[PDB]
Amino acid sequence: REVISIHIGQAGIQVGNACWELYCLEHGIQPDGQMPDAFNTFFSETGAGKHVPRCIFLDLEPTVVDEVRTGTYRQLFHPEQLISGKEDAANNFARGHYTIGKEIVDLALDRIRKLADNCTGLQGFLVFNAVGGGTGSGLGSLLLERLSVDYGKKSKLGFTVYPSPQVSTAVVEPYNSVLSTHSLLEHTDVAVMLDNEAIYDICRRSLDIERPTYTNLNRLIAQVISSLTASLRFDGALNVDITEFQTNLVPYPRIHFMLSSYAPIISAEKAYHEQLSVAEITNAAFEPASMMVKCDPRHGKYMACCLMYRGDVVPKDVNASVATIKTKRTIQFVDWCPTGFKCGINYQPPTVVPGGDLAKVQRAVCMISNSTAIGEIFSRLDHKFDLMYAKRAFVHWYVGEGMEEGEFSEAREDLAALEKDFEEVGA
Amino acid sequence: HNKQLRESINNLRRERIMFESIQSNLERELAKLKRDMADMIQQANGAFEA
Amino acid sequence: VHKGPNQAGNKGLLTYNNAVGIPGYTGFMPSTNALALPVKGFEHTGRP
Amino acid sequence: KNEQNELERAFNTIDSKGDKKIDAEELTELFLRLGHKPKRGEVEDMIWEVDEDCDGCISLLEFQTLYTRCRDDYEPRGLFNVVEFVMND
Amino acid sequence: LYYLLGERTRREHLAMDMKVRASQQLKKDSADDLYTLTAHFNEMRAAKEQ
Amino acid sequence: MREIVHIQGGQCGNQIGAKFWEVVSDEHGIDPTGTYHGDSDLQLERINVYFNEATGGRYVPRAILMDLEPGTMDSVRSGPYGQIFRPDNFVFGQTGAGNNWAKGHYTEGAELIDSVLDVVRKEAESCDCLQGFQVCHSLGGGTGSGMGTLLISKIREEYPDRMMLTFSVVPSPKVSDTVVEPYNATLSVHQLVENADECMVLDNEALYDICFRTLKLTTPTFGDLNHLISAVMSGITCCLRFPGQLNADLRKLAVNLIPFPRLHFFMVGFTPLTSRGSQQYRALTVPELTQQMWDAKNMMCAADPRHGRYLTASALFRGRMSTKEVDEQMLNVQNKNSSYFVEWIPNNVKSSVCDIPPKGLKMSATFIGNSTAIQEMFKRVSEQFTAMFRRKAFLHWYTGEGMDEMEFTEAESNMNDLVSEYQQYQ
Amino acid sequence: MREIVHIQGGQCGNQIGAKFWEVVSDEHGIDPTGTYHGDSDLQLERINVYFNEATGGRYVPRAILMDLEPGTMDSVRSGPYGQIFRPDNFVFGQTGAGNNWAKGHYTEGAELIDSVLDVVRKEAESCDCLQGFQVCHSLGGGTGSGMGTLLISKIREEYPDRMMLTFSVVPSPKVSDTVVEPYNATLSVHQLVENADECMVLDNEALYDICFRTLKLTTPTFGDLNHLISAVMSGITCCLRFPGQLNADLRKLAVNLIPFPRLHFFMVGFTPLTSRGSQQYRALTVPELTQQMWDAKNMMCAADPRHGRYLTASALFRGRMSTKEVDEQMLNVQNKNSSYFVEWIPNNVKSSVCDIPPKGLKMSATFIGNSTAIQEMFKRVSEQFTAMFRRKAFLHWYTGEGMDEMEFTEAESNMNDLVSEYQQYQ
Ligand SMILES: Nc1nc2c(ncn2[C@@H]2O[C@H](COP(=O)(O)OP(=O)(O)OP(=O)(O)O)[C@@H](O)[C@H]2O)c(=O)[nH]1
Ligand SMILES: Nc1nc2c(ncn2[C@@H]2O[C@H](COP(=O)(O)OP(=O)(O)O)[C@@H](O)[C@H]2O)c(=O)[nH]1
């Protein structure tokens, strides 16, 4: 049972730069790459006293990639994986999908080919990218397209980073986001949205760090992913693999967008503070003050929820907890499903990273649900997309690259169809 | 500041929506239960007369 | 009637106690001075 | 009720498609009939502060509770004052 | 004006919440009375059988 | 002589069977290395029902583990009494179904079921006279329900004359693991009512409630729940493995408890079950066991039997007892609560006595009741099935694999006619 | 054979019962670990009245502890002879009523009485031929008075033909611990006049006076008072457990003492009670016992009988005594002070002899007199009840909980006709 992880764009490989640091520490691998069977799902044992990740960083600008090449993880991250282009897509979906994709995607998927042939029990792929940028959106969609036509039946777990409504670093993010979803809809099987402003508020409120950088963000992103694959990496009382989300969380072939959350995101002094048990973290996983997307789940009705439990938990109290949640009436469910839960329990507690701001906790919960607040998110992005598109702003860059208005309009009405789909299902 | 207050009000109203919906569902279930109550009364009367 | 839940005093085969009583005693006897049941007519399970 | 028959007749004459829904755009044509030019962002606010249960659209029940509330006594009377004008004339 | 509107809508929302809580209490009452009535009907069934 | 092979499916089935083979080996006195170390001779004559002598006192169980994910098999070999199975009996897939009944019944079955059929065949003709088959599995999971269900169908087609026991847990909304519980349970039950001879229904909700109230445990892990189910399974099969003053075989219990070919869903209890703090303060008499046995809060289903009637009932006792006391206790229970029994069948209680108690106890019992309160469970499930199916949720992960819609309507109709005929005979 | 189920309610009842079971176990020679260590066979043949053997000489009391604050349970388990009760009989709430009769009768009763009824139902069906029940409780508190009252009412409506003893301490103005003493006593007495067959009025005032004058104790804690009350209760039921020249069971004593269905409030005493300093200067004869029995200062109630008349009286003697001496003494004490006895009833004294003295005495006695002076105690309480009820002090705590005012009017009216008919027969 093995799963490979590809990273697209500037944000994706920074996430991976934190993720694999967490992985090698969790499996006791020094950054040079050797230990002083559970690792087999991420690391292949070459020769003697060496392990190499099942991953490929890829990006168009060489700055961030060769910073990985020269950093502390020279020996661990292997030479061929780190694919780097010569020049950026420059926040231009057309430039990252039609000009430079045509030269880089074949080299990438030919690497993925020999990676899958090295693997034996491939569970699925999982991609890391942000759709606001050019490289993450454009060749990310192009790659996912060629991965779908090549394998198709294998699960594809897409952990995307959407632009925040009020916090924004770029300008053409609406154009690139919409053009990303136009392919993300019919290519990814299981796609999890993670905003930035929510993580800012989480680090501000619970972690009480006044001045956070991207490092702490990516640190807790790795915590979430590691807590999601812990069921495969280690045995538990009730294990749940990568194919179960495919079944238990996606009621329709076009409704796959999952809100994720994590608990307890706590500081060092506050672990000393509070008495921790299952009931309060099961609660705190449902407040919007602890979700990974800046959206209000009270505005929406849940479709299905999944609960990853790590550490020292029995099935008794977690079953009692979800009982209290199901009988609470602050939050409601759809009338379509009576049993809207999918639990999972693993024995190994979450590990800590030196320099990280989380305390070592006895037990933690990773929630992944499905709601209609996402349907509100896409409308919020759609509104500011049409505001800019109405004046034909910035269109000449994409047209000069070689695209037209047809895919603009059809992606616009494609999101409109997605809006209608959500409004119909939520009823 | 006006926009902040407006957003807060909008949130409050959108939660009021959820509250009235769950109220409606609970009322449906309560009506079904009182129907069951009346049925049990009728069954008891029948057994007593028998 | 005589057999009841939760009391292990008077569960012996004989109604009375042979140790300190005559039949029709209706006095309490402990479980220690109470007879044991016969399982079957032949007493062993072996094939030499 | 003797005011309320004409209230609901005023409501459907303000409406054009005849349904429960009235949009700010129909409100713009009503403003054109009144004669004074509304602001750029005024008519959305006027509909938003009164539309309470549903969203975007305004409903007959919403109009009704708004009317009896604004009949009573520091309260937004945005759309109330203008319909009252229709009631007066 | 918007401040006062918020002050009003908060009270209305709290009223809705308390109505929901009362509905839950009535749910519990109705469930208990249903259980007792079913028990009574089973008793009457035993009586008429005897 | 009379032979019972064991078939374990899915994760729950494997962990239940692990505890089951631990307690059976404990009863027959064989150590976890596979050799005999008992004291009494009574254990030797009836190990041929559950074992095969290999070489020099090496008794391997007549078991077949079957699933699709190596985690469960590793957890089997990890714990004690895992070194005694035959590695060839570890018939085993590689992909994994994962809560998808269509995966467990149409795609992965086509390449696993021929192999499991090979090994279960070879293990069937390895012995002389089959009594029947014994399958432990779930109705919520994918690799347990679907694969085990097709296995039942294939087996009942090849050996239609042998008995068959199915210990199947059912899901409940109060202890709910997954989301597709009704889509799995409805289809499996739909197939079990035409294939299986009888089913012993279990559920985790009643077990948790038992360990809370009667056992008064603090942390009811899965180990103790599987421990209770194992004690139940040893209790129902003790008649063949040991002599007694009145012997009741499997077919004997079936013909005593099954009045109609579709009325074969049993609810089970177990006695004695006492808390450790009160373990020495209690007494051991047949009335004491009977009071705990006929209690409604001791059933291992989420079906209050006082909301219906017992069609029939059975109690298998273990220990030195007087059958006169046994029969008068059954008569007292039938005479006092005469409303809770059916009218048109007199003497609704079958009994049996075996003279060997379980290890550590002086006297135990095992209750098996075919009541009509089970229709509450199936209505409770079928209504969730209709709630999801009426708006076609989650339907496409099944229709996209080979299943069609009329199968779901078939399971609906079969579930509905079953519960209606239960309501009829009530 | 004849059976007595013991029920303890409230803090007063539980601690009294704790010393009670200590004394009883001492008399039957069973050590606090629950095994037999006596010497004669006379102790064995009548422990089915009070105990049930669990397994191998482990005798457990037939008692039910019932309260709402775990501190009493802790104080029970902490002391010796604490590990003998069955943990299942520790039926027990969690909130606490706290001197609120409505809390003990309407709020917590509704969810605690069902469970305690199931426990006492199992304890009563565990025995064959009920003689009656024995309920120790208080009248001042809430969880003892109101709860025990509801339990008595439920039991009387279920087992109407069985006897019932209740030992109730009553409040006094001189020993006045709580403040709603009249509000609790009046309602409880109003219910004990209709439900309970007979009760024994006790009070802490007379007990303190006894420990000061006769015992000449320095620090009369609650342990010694409960020791006295325990000795009296043991003296009452000595007749069922040990044979004598003249048996007098509970029902036999009831019919000998109760002339009219409402005249069942008895003042009780106990002899001998002498200080260890003066036990050397005393003798041990039946006159020596009797002239301490009929002493006014030896009654365990604050109702001096020389303010009224005796209706009936009983004496239970224990030890190898001469029945002529017994009867000539009852005749002499009836002829000397003839005015204090009722006129239209000849031979107002029932007597009885048992041949087994308590451990530590050669010859003992127990006086149970049904006088008419108890109208003084009820008058003393009813006037405090009216004094508060005249302008509704403390009333909202009860009326706001479900009770109404006409219950109080009913209670005082029943108290008033009770006292007036005692005065009538005087
Ligand atoms: N959470 C998080 N987001 C990041 C991080 N780095 C970049 N981003 C997001 O990435 C978006 C812009 O895209 P980039 O990742 O900078 O670069 P790109 O996606 O490859 O697109 P190009 O700049 O054209 O190459 C910004 O809106 C950021 O929000 C990071 O370390 N953590
Ligand atoms: N009693 C018991 N039940 C279990 C155990 N493991 C899982 N279950 C139940 O089985 C259901 C899930 O079945 P699963 O093991 O996933 O079936 P599978 O995926 O087909 O192998 C859950 O509802 C659990 O309640 C166990 O060890 N003991």
Ligand SMILES: Nc1nc2c(ncn2[C@@H]2O[C@H](COP(=O)(O)OP(=O)(O)O)[C@@H](O)[C@H]2O)c(=O)[nH]1
């Ligand atoms: N003899 C005796 N009386 C007690 C003891 N504890 C409390 N009391 C009496 O009980 C009365 C108060 O009633 P209480 O015990 O609180 O009743 P409850 O609250 O219902 O349990 C006081 O007047 C005390 O005199 C005790 O240990 N021995």
Ligand SMILES: [Mg+2]
């Ligand atoms: Mg970039």
